Design a protein around this motif. Structure first.
Motif, PDB file in Angstrom:
ATOM      1  N   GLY A 137      35.036 -20.242   4.920  1.00 10.69           N
ATOM      2  CA  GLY A 137      35.704 -21.363   4.277  1.00 10.69           C
ATOM      3  C   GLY A 137      36.571 -22.194   5.210  1.00 10.69           C
ATOM      4  N   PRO A 148      41.178 -20.181   1.537  1.00 10.02           N
ATOM      5  CA  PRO A 148      40.429 -20.865   2.596  1.00 10.02           C
ATOM      6  C   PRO A 148      40.674 -22.358   2.753  1.00 10.02           C
ATOM      7  CG  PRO A 148      39.085 -19.176   1.695  1.00 10.02           C
ATOM      8  CD  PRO A 148      40.302 -19.272   0.780  1.00 10.02           C
ATOM      9  N   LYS A 149      40.805 -23.074   1.646  1.00 11.06           N
ATOM     10  CA  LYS A 149      40.991 -24.515   1.729  1.00 11.06           C
ATOM     11  C   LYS A 149      42.309 -25.069   1.216  1.00 11.06           C
ATOM     12  CE  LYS A 149      36.047 -25.329   1.772  1.00 11.06           C
ATOM     13  NZ  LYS A 149      34.894 -26.035   1.139  1.00 11.06           N
ATOM     14  N   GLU A 168      36.720 -21.564  -7.360  1.00 10.32           N
ATOM     15  CA  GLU A 168      37.492 -21.832  -6.157  1.00 10.32           C
ATOM     16  C   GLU A 168      38.946 -22.007  -6.580  1.00 10.32           C
ATOM     17  OE1 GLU A 168      35.693 -20.991  -3.997  1.00 10.32           O
ATOM     18  OE2 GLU A 168      35.099 -22.703  -2.737  1.00 10.32           O
ATOM     19  N   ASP A 211      34.510 -27.297   5.338  1.00 10.30           N
ATOM     20  CA  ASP A 211      35.431 -26.178   5.507  1.00 10.30           C
ATOM     21  C   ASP A 211      36.711 -26.767   6.075  1.00 10.30           C
ATOM     22  OD1 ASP A 211      33.115 -23.606   6.764  1.00 10.30           O
ATOM     23  OD2 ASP A 211      33.549 -24.307   4.716  1.00 10.30           O
TER      24      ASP A 211
END
Lengths: 198, 204, 250, 233, 244, 244, 222, 196, 243
Positions: free
Chosen positions: C223, G39-40, G73, G183
């Motif tokens: 990610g 992750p984001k 997510e 990403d």
């Protein structure tokens, strides 16, 4: 504060503790024994806050005696001091901390060596040849830094203390009414009844 | 008053060529009164070393706490804890007491047994990790230590050399601090062996 | 109100059997088959997606779950019991490990935590044991790859390969024949598919089979980029397409 | 049947009955008789005190709850002590907080609810005692009948205990008569003693055997025992 | 096997909760009570068996008010009824305290509903031994409800429960058919007095006492009030007259 | 109520015996056999892995021998999961002691604490006891090498040689027959294997079906060393002793 | 400390300097202030360092568990809501001041959280002792519809204003770009304009310089 | 901060400046102080931002659960929930809230909950540090039943004055119109209202 | 021994009878319901039966509005159905408060399924005798149907039916999709999807419906609502002008 001194010689640990108990303007007692025997070979002296002092000493004594009975064994001096340190360390962060400083003198029958532990109310523990709590240390540490020797006999230790008590009776502002001296060695704990003029 | 200035003491860690060094003074006093010249501040669990400055009672307590946790960790994991992992364990153990902190300045030093890579880290009293590659300092003479390290330090020193550098950093910093000194001990760590030396220093 | 069931519901019978645990195992026996095979560079766990109706969307129901980026679980027995166990496992990996050491737990320890949770449903008051057996596959730096089975009692054991559920006896026998300590991941995936075919009655394809592996790191599944020491999860669920491609070489 | 549904108060029988409650009611029937009746100015309680031996005392059956309220019990004495104590507290609360004497009707509602709780929960047991409550409040003289089932009813008169049925029919007959005994307590009491004796059979109400209590317009709830009731035998 | 009826929250092999069903028996064994929804309010009436001449007339009131705009009447174990009303009162007080506005009838119905349903969830409690008829007026009209021991409830045009529920329901159905436009509070009070009288035949052995209450936007200003004196007798007579 | 479903795990039989403890013991008797033998220079712990397969990973397995301390270990006979719950609390107790006194915990103190925990499930709480029996092997500077045993009842005793699990009767007779006070670790290792070898309900006694551990004070050192034998190591000692 | 957040045509970027200080002393000349929530979803904090770090990992842990539970997510508004309710509960005692940014199924987001629990939304933000120097730059060059490149530049220039003009900031610039479709890319030490010059001398001591009283080997193995 | 709510012929309008300061520093110059707790029930916040946000978020939660069970809540009910939170927690809160909502039966309504936690229903209300400067202006220029255009003007002039004298107020002027027709968001920039 | 049928513990066959009997209760109301997914909507249809004439037809429903976006239809006794509806509402409101976004249809379903699993494992809680069908147009997943039962089981559907004649409706729907080859009613308006739903309800049950025999709930982007007798009548009319 009260005078709490300890010195570890060749085969014993000697503890000297002032006899005065003063409140405000009056010396209420001049024969106070600021000590509790925790086990046949371990002695603890204490100084500090008016009521906390004995309550703590007796509470520790009660626990060690309980362990002795339960295990039919005597905890080593090092073991007992660690137990005492933990109790104090818990206390310092509690609602109303025990404001007591102690000296633990014990004769380790397994190692055949005397041991002196100094522990303040914060749970600060250290093992020493000689130690003191209160203002006493300010005149006795350097005195002993000079006169102390590892291989000293019990008799030499007593003369060394006498030198300490004389210095304290000369420069300390308070009248602590002399001290009660006790010896801890391979044979247990005995009180030197003759220090009022040794 | 200030829990961090009652007992005194310092600790410093440095990285070298396939080695790390961690040193500390031996003093333990009560304000102006020096009380013990044998109070060491470095401990180790397996191959991981931990130095702790600050309030003596907490130094002692934290060591007993980490011996306890690393012992259980080994029994469960079936391997000795590594420097990086231990650093996280120290951090979370400190932060867990966020509003009633231990008044200490921990320092971790060691070599990862798998990567052979040298490791050092520092923490504030509530767990914030300081991960420098060169050196970590802690204690009452920390300003002085930062000065000595920033000046004396240079990368990839050989064990024998890192020893001279770490010792001079500790010694000269301690001599400008009333609450530090009174003896010192230095640990030189290598993947295979660990040497411990007591330094000769001013006793005032 | 108030749960007044503070006594055990699982107790010893005169013969020494723990009835409720025995019965829980019987429930596991009626469950759909599931298996796990350990290769030299990975582990594969698989099971059949026994859809309860053609109107149901079998994808919205995963029997193979990720617990940590390097650990996965599959089961046999009561699906609902498994679902809550997965929730609890994912959480215990955080509360009892990641939030303390700053890293995910090694397979054996997380398995140990799950096993503990299951043992308690065997002794605590007012509850029944979990009616499931899990197969947990994972990887961790100091232990490499591993496969574990956790039963309703809380007991767990490491396996080279095994099967649980409906036709476990036959499936295990078949695995003992094809397994060796030199199998590569693809080989295990292949043996896994063959073993699972003997247990499936109807359709056998990437849409009726659920299979995942623990292998190399998948940076593409991380990610983000910029941190060298972070290479991605080792847990990866195979896609329906990826499964079919391997079925043609069956 | 029954045996399978009378194990606790949290179980209904196939016909919708609560046997534990019914068994508790049975403790009342086994209890000594007590009677209550009121006019428009007074309310009276007459109770037959029972004794164990001829060497024992005759257990009290009347409890004062406040200067304007009191009751008579039939059944488990301890349960009466508990309930009357709760009543004493409710009367007390009313005075201290609102400077208001508790209405007999409210006292009845409070008791009903306190008993009801021990009939829908596991672990507890219904109370095993019946109570007759009399009192004079801001709406005159009152008489209440309390049953362990939690049912409380306001009447002109009534009786509970063993053979209570006698006294009860008598009152249901004497109604038009005593309901008018206003301004004359002695008459109301006598009318009560007469109703109670309608349930005798064993012996006859003696001096240390009869117990009477009264409350009214200008009469704080007071209990009469022994020599004090002699003039009514 | 058997024994599925000895513990409260147990499902029998046919999916029933026998203890709730036995609770119903206690309800059917009780006095009859009804409720009638009129064009701007609701009326409540109940049969009060005269056990004996000793019962002080008009004193043992059965209909209970909740807050100031709701009426509640029930058949079965009276103490259980009071218990449920006490809960309703705490429930209404809580709603008013937070939202300021007095509790809407539908909202109130569910509060009693959930509480009653709760008593069918554990074997540590017994189900309620009463069916409750209640309602009142609110921000948007009149509402009548009936709650069973199972916790089941629905809004009603008319409702009855107790010993003579069948007679009552029969009568209520006639009214519903012969008045699609809607009965009035005044009419409903009389009609209610009649139905109680008719439904009293299933207990014609013991004499009884009539009790009515109502809540009408026009007749009581949306507040629950009891029917007394002249309006009461006028309704009693209207019944006594059509009982012959 | 609930009372209906309570087994009452902590009551006496008319004979003064504790049902659950007796039944838990019966359970233990079907568990793989575990043996403990104390020698002058060490202690031996051996256990038979109940049920095995070709696919069982023996290198990563441990179902009977656990390390509690660096000086104490246990052999398990009973429910593995139950054992793990107790083993973990035992490990914690050992560390609490160490932190309190700065000395390793004396073997008996630790055994007594664990036995006390078990005793509790026997007198209060209404929970089933742990279906486990332990053989403790440890060393301390007050009694040196020690061997103890505890079972579901919470009772514990010391031994020179003892067995738990299946066929203890046969195992005990064999042990009481060849044991000798002046034995030596190696003698004991052999005695342990021979005993298991004659009590096994299996065909032969292979290494994949065993777990071995010894606690010796390596002459070349001066400290105590625990050694949980590895698969290969067991295979070796198996051939040497003449079992191949 | 100097941290900033800047939204651009298809995402959001955050940056921070790398100086850690204890009073006037620089403890860590190159610490990383950019933390990962998921992750984001990245975060940068100022104030009590242990607090920003801990609060970030706690919510990060719960955000992961929530993501696994919902099979979706993580959303920036979730991290925002969990952080703020936590901080609010501690009445400002958890000295965490943060700028949280990230992309999720609903788009790109930029928020700021204060120790007491209040949150803000914007297109450009700055926090920390260098807050004012950075904002002076942002107020001078920001414009709507910036390109990823312009954003990196603007944010980078903002941290520099803080590095040069704020004593509480210095060393390097760390950046993290979060673009809606890709990403997140963490650019550690994206800028290093403060390299220490070669020292004038080497202080390597001749061996034997330090006096030793006693020596010995330490046992590591068990 | 300068915030106000004004009822008029077709319902009610909420307005506010957009400045949030921490000392003399403007932490946010484009803050949105018009907070939605329900479709047609909004509020203007003053006092501690942490506090009013926590309050608003909880109220919104309560109104959402209220709707799910009993349908759309009255503005009075919303003001009640705010009150309960502000009164009961008065020792640990610093929140001044103006609640404004449009009901079909009750049309537009305004309730002001000042520091103590008391509630006051009013034709219009002003609050915030900047409000002291417009008590005179608003009192002289407010009229009941004004038109949407007149109300927007009254608010625009009132707030421009508040922004003019109060350093804690500034930026743009945001408005929210609440009527049977729906919800409308308005914004007015400095260059416009500064020259009124 | 024989009590392994009163509380939720295993039977020697590893079965949970109380859970099975709970399933039995779900048909006690003798009502059938079905759900289908449109292109951008989700429709739930349920028979409405009001036997008593003394009842207020407007208060008889088994469709609930859990949140602005989630709708739930229940098959089972009304009290347990309302118990389930209240919980789901509270759960949906709390989720939005803590996590900042609307609780997704599938997540609410999992949550209620988990709660159900618990009644299945703890002895003091009885299972609820109901089956819950949740619907919405999820912002991430689109039209959604998730159903949960007394076992704690739940899954998503292309379409589904529930009640005594569930099987007939199911196979009817199954056949339609085998034919269309797509997993939804390819209609642009919800009115037509509602018509498709009712049409197939009739074919499968072999019964005609008046405007008061049905109950309809519809889910669209950002909103879930139920139809009125009149909205339905209009629907019934439309389908009539085709047959």
């Amino acid at each position: 504060m009260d005078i709490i001194l300890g010195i570890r010689v060749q085969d014993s640990v000697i503890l000297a503790s002032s006899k005065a108990v003063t409140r405000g303007i009056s010396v209420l007692k001049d024969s106070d024994d600021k000590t509790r025997q925790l086990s046949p070979h371990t002695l603890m002296s204490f100084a500090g806050e008016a009521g906390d002092t004995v309550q703590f000493a007796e509470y520790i004594q009660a626990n060690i005696q309980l362990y002795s009975i339960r295990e039919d064994y005597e905890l080593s001096p090092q073991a007992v001091s660690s137990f005492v340190r933990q109790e104090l360390a818990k206390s310092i962060r509690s609602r109303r901390p025990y404001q007591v400083n102690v000296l633990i003198g014990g004769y380790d029958k397994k190692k055949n060596k005397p041991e002196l532990y100094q522990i303040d109310y914060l749970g600060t523990k250290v093992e020493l040849p000689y130690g003191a709590h209160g203002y006493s240390g300010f005149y006795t540490f350097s005195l002993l830094d000079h006169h102390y020797r590892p291989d000293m006999t019990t008799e030499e230790g007593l003369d060394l203390l006498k030198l300490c008590v004389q210095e304290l009776e000369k420069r300390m502002p308070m009248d602590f009414k002399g001290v009660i001296v006790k010896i801890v060695d391979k044979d247990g704990i005995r009180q030197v009844d003759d220090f009022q003029a040794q | 008053s200030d829990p961090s200035s009652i007992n005194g003491g310092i600790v410093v860690a440095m990285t070298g060529k396939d080695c790390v060094a961690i040193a500390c003074d031996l003093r333990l006093g009560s304000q102006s009164l020096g009380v013990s010249n044998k109070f060491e501040k470095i401990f180790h669990y397996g191959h991981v070393f931990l130095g702790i400055t600050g309030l003596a009672t907490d130094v002692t307590t934290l060591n007993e706490m980490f011996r306890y946790k690393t012992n259980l960790y080994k029994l469960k994991e079936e391997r000795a804890i590594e420097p990086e992992t231990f650093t996280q364990l120290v951090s979370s153990s400190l932060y867990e007491r966020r509003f009633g902190p231990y008044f200490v300045g921990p320092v971790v030093a060691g070599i990862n047994s798998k990567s052979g890579k040298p490791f050092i880290a520092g923490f504030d009293l509530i767990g914030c990790i300081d991960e420098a590659k060169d050196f970590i300092v802690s204690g009452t003479a920390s300003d002085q230590l930062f000065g000595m390290c920033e000046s004396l330090y240079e990368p990839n020193l050989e064990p024998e050399d890192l020893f001279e550098t770490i010792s001079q950093a500790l010694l000269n910093a301690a001599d400008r601090d009333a609450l530090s000194g009174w003896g010192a001990v230095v640990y030189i760590i290598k993947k295979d062996e660990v040497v411990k030396r007591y330094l000769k220093m001013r006793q005032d | 109100m108030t749960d007044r069931y503070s006594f055990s519901l699982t107790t010893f019978s005169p013969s020494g059997k723990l009835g409720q645990i025995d019965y829980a195992l019987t429930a596991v026996k009626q469950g759909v088959t599931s298996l796990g095979i350990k290769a030299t560079n990975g582990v594969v766990i698989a099971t059949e997606k026994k859809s309860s109706s053609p109107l149901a969307m079998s994808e919205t129901l995963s029997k193979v779950s990720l617990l940590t980026p390097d650990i996965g679980a599959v089961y046999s027995g009561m699906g609902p019991d498994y679902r809550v166990l997965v929730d609890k496992s994912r959480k215990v990996a955080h509360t009892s490990y990641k939030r303390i050491y700053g890293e995910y737990p090694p397979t054996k320890l997380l398995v140990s935590e799950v096993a503990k949770i299951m043992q308690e449903a065997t002794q605590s008051g007012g509850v029944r044991p979990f009616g499931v057996s899990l197969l947990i596959a994972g990887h961790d730096e100091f232990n490499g790859f591993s496969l574990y089975q956790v039963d309703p009692s809380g007991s767990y054991f490491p396996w080279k390969a095994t099967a649980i559920g409906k036709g476990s006896v036959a499936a295990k026998t078949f695995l003992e024949k094809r397994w060796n300590d030199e199998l590569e991941l693809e080989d295990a995936i292949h043996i896994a598919l063959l073993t699972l075919k003997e247990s499936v009655e109807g359709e056998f394809n990437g849409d009726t089979i659920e299979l995942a592996i623990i292998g190399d790191e998948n940076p593409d599944l991380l990610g983000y980029t910029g941190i060298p020491t972070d290479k991605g999860p080792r847990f990866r669920k195979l896609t329906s397409q990826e499964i079919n491609d391997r079925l043609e070489a069956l | 049947f029954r045996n399978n549904y009378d194990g606790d108060t949290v179980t209904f029988s196939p016909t919708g009955r609560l046997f534990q409650v019914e068994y508790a009611l049975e403790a009342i029937k086994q209890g000594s008789v007590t009677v209550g009746l009121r006019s428009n100015t007074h309310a009276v309680l007459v109770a037959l005190k029972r004794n164990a031996d001829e060497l024992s005392s005759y257990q009290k059956k009347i409890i004062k709850c406040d200067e304007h309220m009191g009751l008579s019990l039939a059944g488990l004495a301890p349960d009466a002590r508990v309930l009357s104590n709760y009543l004493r507290q409710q009367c007390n609360y009313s005075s201290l907080v609102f400077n208001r004497k508790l209405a007999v009707e409210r006292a009845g509602h409070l008791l009903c609810d306190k008993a009801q709780k021990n009939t829908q929960s596991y672990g507890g047991r219904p109370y095993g005692v019946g109570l007759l409550i009399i009192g004079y409040d801001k709406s005159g003289a009152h008489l209440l009948e309390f049953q362990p089932s939690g049912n409380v009813t306001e009447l002109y008169g009534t009786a509970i205990g063993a053979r209570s049925q006698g006294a009860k029919t008598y009152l249901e007959r004497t109604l038009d008569t005593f309901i008018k005994i206003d301004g004359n307590p002695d008459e109301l009491i006598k009318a009560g003693v007469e109703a109670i004796s309608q349930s005798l059979r064993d012996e006859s109400l003696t001096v240390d055997n009869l117990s009477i209590a009264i409350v009214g317009k200008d009469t704080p709830f007071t209990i009469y025992d022994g020599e004090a009731v002699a003039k009514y035998i | 096997g058997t024994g599925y009826d000895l513990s409260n929250s147990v499902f029998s092999p046919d999916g029933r909760n026998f203890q709730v069903e036995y609770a119903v028996k206690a309800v059917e064994n009780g006095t009859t009570s009804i409720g009638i929804k009129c064009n701007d309010g609701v009326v409540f009436a109940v049969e009060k068996l005269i056990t004996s001449k000793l019962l002080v007339p008009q004193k043992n009131v059965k209909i209970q008010v909740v807050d100031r705009h709701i009426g509640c009447v029930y058949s079965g174990l009276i103490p259980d009824g009071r218990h449920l009303v006490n809960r309703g009162r705490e429930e209404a007080a809580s709603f008013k305290k937070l939202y300021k506005t007095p509790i809407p009838i539908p909202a109130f119905a569910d509060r009693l509903g959930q509480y009653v349903q709760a008593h069918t969830l554990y074997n540590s409690v017994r189900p309620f031994g009463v069916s409750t008829i209640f309602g009142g007026v609110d921000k948007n009209g009149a509402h009548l409800y009936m709650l069973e021991p199972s916790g089941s409830y629905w809004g009603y045009k008319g409702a009855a429960t107790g010993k003579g529920r069948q007679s009552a329901k029969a009568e209520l159905e006639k009214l519903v058919d012969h008045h699609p436009e809607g009965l009035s509070a005044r009419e409903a009070v009389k009609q209610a007095a009649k139905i109680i009288y008719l439904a009293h035949e299933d207990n014609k052995e013991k004499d009884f006492e009539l009790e009515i209450s109502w809540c009408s936007l026009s007749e009581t200003n949306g507040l629950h009030k009891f029917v007394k004196g002249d309006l009461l007798q006028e309704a009693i007579d209207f019944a006594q007259k059509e009982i012959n | 109520g609930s009372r209906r479903y309570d087994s009452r795990t902590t009551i006496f039989s008319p004979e003064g015996r504790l049902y659950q403890v007796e039944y838990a013991l019966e359970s233990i008797s079907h568990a793989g056999t575990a043996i403990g033998i104390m020698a002058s220079d060490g202690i031996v712990l051996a256990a038979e892995r109940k049920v095995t397969s070709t696919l069982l990973e023996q290198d990563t397995s441990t179902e009977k021998l656990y390390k509690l301390n660096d000086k104490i270990a246990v052999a398990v006979a009973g429910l593995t999961a139950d054992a793990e719950i107790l083993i973990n609390t035992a490990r914690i107790h050992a560390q609490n002691y160490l932190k309190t006194y700065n000395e390793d915990i004396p073997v008996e103190i630790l055994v007594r604490r664990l036995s006390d925990i078990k005793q509790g499930y026997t007198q209060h709480g209404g929970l089933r006891p742990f279906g486990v029996s332990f053989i403790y092997a440890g060393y301390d500077d007050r009694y040196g090498y020690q061997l103890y045993t505890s079972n579901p009842s919470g009772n514990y005793t010391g031994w020179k040689a003892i067995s738990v699990g299946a066929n203890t009767s046969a195992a005990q007779t064999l042990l009481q027959m060849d044991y000798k006070d002046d034995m030596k670790v190696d003698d004991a290792i052999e005695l342990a294997l021979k005993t298991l070898s004659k009590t096994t309900d299996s065909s032969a006694l292979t290494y994949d079906r065993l777990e071995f551990a010894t606690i010796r004070k390596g002459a070349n050192d001066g400290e105590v060393y625990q050694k949980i034998f590895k698969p290969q190591e067991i295979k070796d000692i198996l051939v040497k002793t003449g079992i191949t | 400390t100097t941290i900033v957040g800047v939204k651009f045509n298809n995402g959001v970027v955050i940056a921070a300097d790398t100086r850690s200080t204890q009073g006037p002393i620089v403890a860590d000349k190159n610490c990383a202030k950019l933390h990962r929530i998921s992750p984001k979803i990245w975060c940068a904090g100022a104030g009590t360092a242990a607090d920003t770090e801990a609060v970030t990992q706690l919510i990060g842990s719960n955000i992961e568990l929530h993501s696994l539970y919902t099979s979706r997510e993580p959303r920036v508004v979730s991290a925002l809501q969990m952080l703020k309710q936590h901080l609010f509960k501690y009445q400002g005692h958890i000295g965490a001041y943060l700028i949280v940014a990230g992309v999720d199924p609903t788009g790109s987001h930029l928020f700021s959280i204060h120790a007491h629990g209040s949150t803000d939304v914007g297109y450009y933000l700055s926090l920390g002792s260098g807050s004012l120097a950075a904002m002076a730059v942002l107020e001078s060059h920001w414009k709507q519809d910036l390109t990823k490149e312009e954003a990196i530049k603007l944010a980078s220039d903002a941290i520099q204003a803080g590095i040069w003009n704020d004593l509480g900031s210095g060393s390097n610039v760390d950046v993290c770009v979060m673009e809606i479709g890709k990403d997140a890319e963490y650019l550690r030490n994206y800028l290093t304009p403060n390299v220490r010059e070669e020292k004038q001398k080497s202080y390597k001591f001749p061996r034997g310089t330090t006096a030793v009283l006693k020596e010995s080997i330490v046992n590591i193995c068990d | 901060t300068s915030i106000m709510a004004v009822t008029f012929k077709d319902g009610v309008i909420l307005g506010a400046d957009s400045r949030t300061t921490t000392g003399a520093y403007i932490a946010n110059r484009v803050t949105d102080k018009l907070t939605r707790v329900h479709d047609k029930i909004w509020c203007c916040r003053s006092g501690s931002a942490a506090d009013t946000q926590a309050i608003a978020d909880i109220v919104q939660y309560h109104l959402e659960l209220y709707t799910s069970q009993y349908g759309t809540p009255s503005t009075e009910t919303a003001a009640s929930v705010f009150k309960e939170l502000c009164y009961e927690n008065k020792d640990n809160l610093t929140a001044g809230i103006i609640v404004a909502g449009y009901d079909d039966k009750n049309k537009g309504e305004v309730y002001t909950i000042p520091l103590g936690g008391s509630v006051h229903k009013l034709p219009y209300a002003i609050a915030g540090s900047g409000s002291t400067f417009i008590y005179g202006y608003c009192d002289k220029n407010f009229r009941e039943n004004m038109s949407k255009e007149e109300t927007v003007d009254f608010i625009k002039h009132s707030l421009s004055q508040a922004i003019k004298w109060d350093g804690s107020s500034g930026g743009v002027i945001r408005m929210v119109v609440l009527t049977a027709a729906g919800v409308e968001r308005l914004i007015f920039y400095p260059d416009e209202y500064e020259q009124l | 021994a024989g009590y392994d049928r009163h509380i939720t513990i295993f039977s020697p066959e590893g079965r949970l009878y109380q859970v099975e009997y709970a399933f039995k209760a779900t048909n006690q109301t003798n009502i059938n319901s079905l759900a289908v997914r449109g292109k951008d909507c989700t429709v739930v249809i349920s028979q409405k039966k009001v036997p008593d004439k003394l009842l207020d037809p407007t208060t008889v429903s088994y469709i609930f509005c859990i949140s602005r976006t989630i709708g739930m239809v229940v098959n089972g006794p009304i009290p347990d159905a309302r118990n389930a509806a209240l919980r789901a509402k509270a759960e949906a409101a709390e989720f939005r408060y803590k996590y900042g976004y609307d609780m997704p249809c599938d997540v609410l379903a999992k949550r209620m399924a988990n709660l159900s699993q618990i009644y299945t494992q703890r002895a003091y809680m009885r299972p609820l005798g109901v089956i819950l069908t949740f619907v919405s147009v999820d912002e991430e997943l689109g039209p959604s149907i998730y159903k949960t039962d007394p076992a704690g089981y739940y899954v998503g559907y292309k379409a589904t039916a529930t009640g005594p004649k569930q099987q007939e409706i199911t196979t009817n729907l199954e056949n339609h999709f085998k034919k269309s080859k797509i997993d939804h009613i390819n209609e642009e308006s919800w009115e037509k999807v509602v018509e498709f739903a009712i049409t197939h309800m009739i074919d499968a049950l072999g019964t005609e419906f008046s405007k008061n025999d049905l109950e309809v709930g519809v889910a669209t982007k950002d909103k879930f609502f139920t139809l009125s007798a009149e909205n339905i009548e209009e629907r019934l009319v439309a389908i009539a002008e085709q047959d």
